[PDB]
Amino acid sequence: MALRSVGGMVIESPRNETEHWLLETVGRQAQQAGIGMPTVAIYDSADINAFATGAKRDDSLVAVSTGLLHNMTRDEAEAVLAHEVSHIANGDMVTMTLMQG
Amino acid sequence: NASKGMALRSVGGMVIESPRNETEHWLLETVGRQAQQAGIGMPTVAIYDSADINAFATGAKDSLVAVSTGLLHNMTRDEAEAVLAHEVSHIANGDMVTMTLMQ
Ligand SMILES: [Cl-]
Ligand code: NA
Ligand code: NA
Numbered sequence: 001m002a003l004r005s006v007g008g009m010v011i012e013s014p015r016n017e018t019e020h021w022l023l024e025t026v027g028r029q030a031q032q033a034g035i036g037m038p039t040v041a042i043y044d045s046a047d048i049n050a051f052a053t054g055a056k057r058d059d060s061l062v063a064v065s066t067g068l069l070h071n072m073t074r075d076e077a078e079a080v081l082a083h084e085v086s087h088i089a090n091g092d093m094v095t096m097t098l099m100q101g
Numbered sequence: 102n103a104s105k106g107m108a109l110r111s112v113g114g115m116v117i118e119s120p121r122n123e124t125e126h127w128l129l130e131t132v133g134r135q136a137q138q139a140g141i142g143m144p145t146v147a148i149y150d151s152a153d154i155n156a157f158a159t160g161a162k163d164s165l166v167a168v169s170t171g172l173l174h175n176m177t178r179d180e181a182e183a184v185l186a187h188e189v190s191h192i193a194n195g196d197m198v199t200m201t202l203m204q
Contacts, residue, residue, distance in 0.1 A: 053203075055203070055204075079187075079190065083183075083187045086183065087202065090180070092203070092204050093202065093203040093204075094200065094201070094202050095201050096198065096199070096200040097198070097199050097200075098191065098196055098197065098198050099161075099196065099197040099198075100196050101160065101161040101194075101196050
């Protein structure tokens, strides 16, 4: 439900540099946090947002907005994702929204 | 008259100057340490009343960090410290951030 309700679109295998980077980044962070690979999705929003859940209720998931991928550098986005993966590992849902100054 | 000098409940929406209770002291100390480590000035810190678990911050100008009572009720010190450290990193970049948890 966490994905469907936002119209999130799952990346099943990487087909461009952005998908490759997102999967490898989340994969490395999940590995380091001692958890299974989450489903990874992109959804449409102008906001710079990522949300993630490792709650019992949900399939494990990391979803990033198109606005995040458009506006964040890889280094910036990797920091946000690493923090959200820490919440998944805690069995929580997290959403974070940023605005650049 | 009985309550004068005792630890008091945080006032939602009030900027924290002199801690009213031990959580306020911990919050100033934690944010102060993170700010020092990130190389920025001490943010203004406030607690606001909400059942939602949220902290937000802005470093666009100096900065402010605002934490919900829901967050303080629901997160351990280590968990809250990690959220605050992450938000301080955004302030240090001159950015603004808001983060909400559903536990
Ligand atoms: Cl409290
Ligand atoms: Na879009
Ligand atoms: Na609320």
